Write the C-alpha cells for this entry.
Amino acid sequence: VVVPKTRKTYCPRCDKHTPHKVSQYKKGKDSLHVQGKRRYDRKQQGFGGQTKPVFKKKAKTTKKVVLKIECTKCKYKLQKCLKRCKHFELGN
Amino acid sequence: SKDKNRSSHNQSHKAHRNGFYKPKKSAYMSTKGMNVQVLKNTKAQRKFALAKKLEAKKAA
Amino acid sequence: PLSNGRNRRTRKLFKRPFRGHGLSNTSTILHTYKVGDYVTILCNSSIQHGLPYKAFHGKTGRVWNVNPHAIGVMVNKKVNNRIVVKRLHISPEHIKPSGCQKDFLERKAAVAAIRKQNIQLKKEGKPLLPLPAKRLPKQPRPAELIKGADIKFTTVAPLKFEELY
RNA sequence: AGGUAGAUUACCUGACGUUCCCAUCUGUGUGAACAUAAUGGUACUGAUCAGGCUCUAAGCAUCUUUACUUCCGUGUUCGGAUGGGAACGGGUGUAUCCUACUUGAUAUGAACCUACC
RNA sequence: GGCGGCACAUCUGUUACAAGAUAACGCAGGUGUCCAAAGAUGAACUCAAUGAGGACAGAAACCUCAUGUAGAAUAUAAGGGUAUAAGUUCAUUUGAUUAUUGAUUCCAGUACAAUCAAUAACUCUGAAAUGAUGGCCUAACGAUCCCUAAGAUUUUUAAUUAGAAAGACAUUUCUAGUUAAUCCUUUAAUAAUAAGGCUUGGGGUGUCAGAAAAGUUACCACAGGGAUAACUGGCUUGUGGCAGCCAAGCGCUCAUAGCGACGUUGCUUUUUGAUCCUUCGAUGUCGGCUCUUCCUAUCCAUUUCAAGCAGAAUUGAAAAAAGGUAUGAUUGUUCACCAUUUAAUAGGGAACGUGAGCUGGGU
RNA sequence: GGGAACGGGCUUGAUUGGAACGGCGGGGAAAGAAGACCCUGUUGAGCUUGACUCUAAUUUAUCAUGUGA
RNA sequence: AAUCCGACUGUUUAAUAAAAACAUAGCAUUCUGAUAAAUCUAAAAGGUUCAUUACAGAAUGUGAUUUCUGCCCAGUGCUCUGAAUGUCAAGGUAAUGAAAUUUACUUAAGCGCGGGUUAACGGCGAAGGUAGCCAAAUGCCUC
RNA sequence: GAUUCACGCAGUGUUAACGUGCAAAUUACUUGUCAUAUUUGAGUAUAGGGGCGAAAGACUCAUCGAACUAUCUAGUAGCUGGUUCCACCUGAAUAUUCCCUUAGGAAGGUCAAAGUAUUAAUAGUAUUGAUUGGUAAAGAUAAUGAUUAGGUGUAACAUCUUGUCAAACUAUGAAUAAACAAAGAAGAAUUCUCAGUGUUAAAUACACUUCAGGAAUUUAAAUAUAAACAUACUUUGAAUCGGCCAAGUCUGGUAAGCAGGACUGGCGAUGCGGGAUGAACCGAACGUCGAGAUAAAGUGCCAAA
RNA sequence: GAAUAGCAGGAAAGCUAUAACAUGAAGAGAAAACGAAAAACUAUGAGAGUGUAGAAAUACAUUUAGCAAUAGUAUCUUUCAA
RNA sequence: UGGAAGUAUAAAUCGAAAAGGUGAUAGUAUUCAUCAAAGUCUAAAUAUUACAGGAAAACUGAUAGCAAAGAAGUACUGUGAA
C-alpha cells in the first residue's frame, strides 16, 4: 500500500545490515529473440489461423506487488513479494 | 438425474475386514527432528565407541 | 454442511473453562518433561501461536523429543484403514502430564519394596515374602454369617399410587 | 509474631463493622542532585519529626459468594431387546447406567524457601 | 430441461447425533479486500456504563471522586482469545530479511497452500530474562509451457619471479609475492554481442488441479434413457369436495325448527398440486356421437319423522339405487350462459370408459 | 391380494365338456416403426450473425529498368 | 343479403397444404458511357446479358385503378465534388555498433472528424404516431 | 391474356372406394379447367456448396435442408445388443481425492491368486486406573435473548416473588463413546564398576548414547477372556463406486411407497420353515441322505398337531 | 537363429563360427567437471552341542553360532540440495 | 524436415567471386580441419501380392478356401457409373 524507500535490511553479499533503496518491479520489455518468441513466430507463419490459445477469461483485478530492494553500497538486489492490493504507492 | 451425495454405510465393515493396521515398532524409534545437541552428543559417543572397537580388532 | 477451516466447529471445544480465563498456572511451564513420558494434549485457545490441531485434543501421547521451548509428542492417528504415527512439537502450554500409569507405577513400587526385603531376608536365612497378589475382577463373595443380635427387618412391598398433583 | 520471593489460584472474593503493632511492613517529612511529569499526586531520589488513621494481617456475623457431604432421586435421561400394548401420537415391562437445579449441614484457607523477632 | 441461483475455490455459527468423519437448490451470514502501521519491541495507563459534584453547560461539550470481570475496544462475517493486555497513549525500529533442515493440517498420506519446531547469519526492542522469519486465531487465493525479473566474487585455475622435495642422455608437487580469468553451455579453438541452462519470485487461468469458443432449427438427423418431463395408474391430500364434535350468538322471548362464530376431528379421489415407481426397440394424445354397467354424498316418483308445518307451496332428516332424469341458440369446447319443456330435467366412476367404434371441430 | 404400485400363469376363492361355424370389436397395456415430443451424448447437419479462426472476390501501397527534357 | 383477403387472366409444395402464398401490369429506388455494370472460370488473343449501347444493360422493394404517402440523418448502413498530421503495414532514409541487432524519421487505403441520404435498416415518450383504421386473419383483460 | 360446352387435362370435396390395393398415389362421383403467360413430341443446353426454380427448400430417374455410385473404411462411439464345457474353493462394491467431472475415468478402499517371515508381529470384548468431550437432561433476578402476573420502596425505576421458553443461550451435565496404561533394544529387578559429548558456577547432579558398555546375584511375576490352518504381510491383478430396505433415529415438507443424512443389520448376491400371497418382516443361512430332539409359529376342516 | 559366413545331405530343418552390439557389472549432476570401506558397528533373530528329569514322546538348565529380514549407525561418491 | 535465430524445395525481388563451401545457436574477427558445388554415365550386392512357369505346406475342405471346385465376373439388376 504505502511503503517508504530507504529500508535497512540484511544484505546477503555484504553479510551485514546496510541501507537499501526500494522501488517497484515492472515487467521488462519483451525480447524478439528469445527462444519462446522465435518458436511462436514460426508457428504463426503460414496458413492455419491462430495456432496457440489466447486467454480472454481474466478474473483477477489486482496484482501482487514485488518490491526491488537494492543495496546502496553494493547494488545487490532483493525481490520481496507483498500481498495483492488495489492501490499501491511508495512513501516519502 | 439427481444422485445420492454421500453415505458412510458399509464403511466401518469395510475398514475392519483387514483391520486397523498398527505401525511397527520401528515407526516409534525414528530420530529425524530430534534435538540438535542430543544428536551431536549421541554421534560423538558412537564415533568414539566405534573407533575404540576398531583398534581392538587391529590389535587381535 | 460444515466448512473446512482449520478451527471449524470449535465454539465449545476452544472455549475456556468457566471462571478459568486469563493466565495459566506456572506448574504448566515448570513441569519437567523427559523422553518417554506420558502427556495429554490439551489445546489452550488462550495461546494462539502453536495451537495443536483440534483432532489431537485430549489424546494421550508420549514424549519423544525435548526442545528448548517445545516438547515432542507422539500420537497415533487413525486413517482410512490403518494407523499412522504423528510427531508433533507442542509448547508446554498445550500439554499436561498424564496419570494413565499412576496405578501401575504404584504397583511397580509395591513389588520392588517387597523385592528389597527379599534380598535381605535371604542373607539372614529366613523365609522370603511373596509378591503382591495380582488384580482380579470383583470375585464372587464368600459365605458369611450375620449375627442376629443387632439386626432389624424392614418389609419391602409395592407402594400404593399417589397422584403427584 | 513480621517481612521477601512464591506455588494452589475465592475455603483466598465483596460488603458491614472490630483488634494489636515490641521489631517488620505501611502509611510519614523534603525537593538539592539522577529522574519525573500540566501538578514532588504518580514514578524518582534524600530522610526519620510524629502515627496504628488507612493498608496488610487476625478474628465477628442465622452476611451474599465460593468449596466439600447428604438429600434431591434411582425421580430426568439413557445403552440393549418382542409376532410387547396403541388407529395415531407417543408411552411399557426386562437386563442395565443414572444427571442437574434446589434445599440442608459443615468450612471460610492449606502450604514451601530465606531473613528478622 | 430452460429462466433463476452457485450449494463450482472458499470461512463462521447451526442442522450434527459430547472422539474423527459427516447430506439436501437446509438455516443466518461472509471472501477475492485492508494495513509503514493496523508489523516488532519497551514503558505507562484502564475500558463501556452509572452515581455524586463544578460559570455559561441544558438529556448530550469539558473537569473531579467513587463503583465498575470487560457489560468497551481489538480493519472486517461469525465464533473463539485478551485487563499491570492482545485495548488506549507514548518511544525506538523494519525480523514483512537471507540460508539449511524435520514435522503437522488438506491428503492419494501428491502438488499448491497453510500451521509449526529447530539450526547458521545479520539485525530491532528492552536494564534484562526473553520477544520478533508479518497482522490475536479460524477465510482473504493458483500447475505444465511461454514471457519477465533477481542470484551464482566466500573458491578453483593458469603464466612468471624466490625457495624446496621427488622425476627417463621432458615434466609434475608444496610455499610465499605477483598479474590475469573466474555459475555451466552454444560440440575444431578463442573473443565482445546474442541465445540457452540452474535456483527463486511476478505475469494466470474465479468452470478457482487451470480448453482459446454465439445463436437457431416447426426442414431436422443419429446413439441411447423410463437414470428424465408431457397422459393413465400407484403413495400423499396442502388445495378442491363432503361430513362431524363444542356452543358465543342469530332466530320477536328461545344456544340446537333452521343456522352456527372462536376452536377442533375426519372422510373422498369426481379439482389442482407434490413425487418420478411402471412405460422412450411407442399403452394412438381433447371433446362430441354410440352403448353397457357401477357408486350414493337422492333431483323425481314410493314409505316415514320434524318445523318458526292452519290449507297450499316449502324446509331439515331416515328407509331405498329396482325405474326415470329432455329439446335447443353461441362456443371445438369440458365448462359457461341464456330460451323452453318436464314429475325431475341429480352428482360422479369404469386407463380423466369408449379412435383395427366413428368424427377430426380443438391441440 | 400382493407384486415393478392395471396378471393368462403366482396365493385364496368363483368355477370348467371335447371339437368348432357365423358374427363381433371388450381384452391380448393386439400388429406396423431401435419415440419424431422431452432429456442426455464432450454425436451431427441445414440456416443466421463483428461467435472464434480463416478464405475467394474487391481494394490500397512498394518492387519489377522504353526514350528526350 | 353482407363481411375479410388477393386487384384481374396465370403459377405452386409429383405422394396429406391450391390458398390470403408466387407471378403480374402499375409505382419507386440504385449503379453503369460499353476498355463499363453485373458475373462464370484455376488460367486464358476465355465466357454471358451483348447480333447489345441509357426509350439500354444490370440490382432491388411494393404490388391494378382512385386518394395519400406524415415527422426523424441521433445509431447501423451507403455516399461525398472534402479533411490533415488523431491513429495507421511492408517498405524507404538516417544514426550507433565489429556485426546481427537496436533506435529515430517519413510513407497508402481504411478507421476517427465533417456534409448528404429513410419508396436505405429502421424509430415515432434524431422525432414523439400525422392522415387514416380497429376487440380487425392484428385487443391479453375479453364471451 | 371476355363468358361457356366438347375432345383432353387436373385434383376442390366426398376427408367416398382401396388401404397385405388395379395402383410403392390408383378408382368413382362431384368440381375446376379446357389456345396465345395454351397443350404437346423429338432434337438440344444447364450437373452436385452445382444446376433449374411464376419461390413450395420445390425438382435434379420411387433417392434431395445437398443426387447416385465406388474408395479412404472393418470411419469413431464414455451408448444399446450378444459373448459358446463341467465339478471344486475363495468371494465383493455405492466411502475418500482429482477430472469439460455427473451414463465415464485415475489414486484409494473392499476381493482373488501367487510368494514369503519364527514372528518388538493379536483384539469391532469386558474389568481396574488417570483422562477428553458438552449431546440427552437441567436452568431461567445463574451470564445472552424471549416472556405472564403479583407484592414492597422511591407510569417509570429498583427490589422480592410467580408462570412459561431457545437449532444458531448457558453454570452443571450423563448413557453410549474416543484415546491411554495394566512390564518387548526384544521377560524382571538389584548390587558393584563405569565411558563420550553436552548442560552446569563446577560438577560425583542431569540428558542422550543397545536404561554407551562390563561383571555378579536373583528371576518367568505383574487384570479377565479368546487367539499357531495364530500373526505380520509382499507382489500382481479383477470387479465396483446408479444402490434400495428396516428402525424405541434426525432434517426439508401438510404429507408421500417423497428428498436427504448418523449407527447397525439386511436385500442386492439368498435359497429354506412361518406371516394365505410379498426383495427387505420373524426363525434360520444351504454337499447327498437316515433317525431324533427343536426355532419362528401353530393345533375345527382345507392343514401335521 | 545381428546381419553374415561355413558343414554334411540333396535339407525354409540341424550343427559350427573369440564377435559388432544389447542389457548388466557404478552412481549422481541441467551441464562443465567428477566418480564410492572404518577389510564396517548395534539390536532381535535361523542352526549346532551337552546335562538332568519326566519318562513314551518330550520338557528345563547350560556352551557356541550368529545367515536372511527389519530398523538404526559410523565412513565414502555425486549434487545447490541425500 | 528430427534439423531447433532455418534441414530441403519453389516463387517474387535481388544477386557474387584476382574463387570459394562446410564444421547444424544468430553476429563479427583471427586461426584450424576437410572438401572444391552450380554438366553426364556407371555393373554388383537390393525390392516384387501384376503376369507366366514350377515346388512346397502343423493352411481350407463345398455356408470353408478366391466372388468363381460345372458354359464365374457367368445368371441376374440398373439409363449409367456400377
In short: The CA atoms of residues 6 and 91 of chain A lie 10 Å apart.
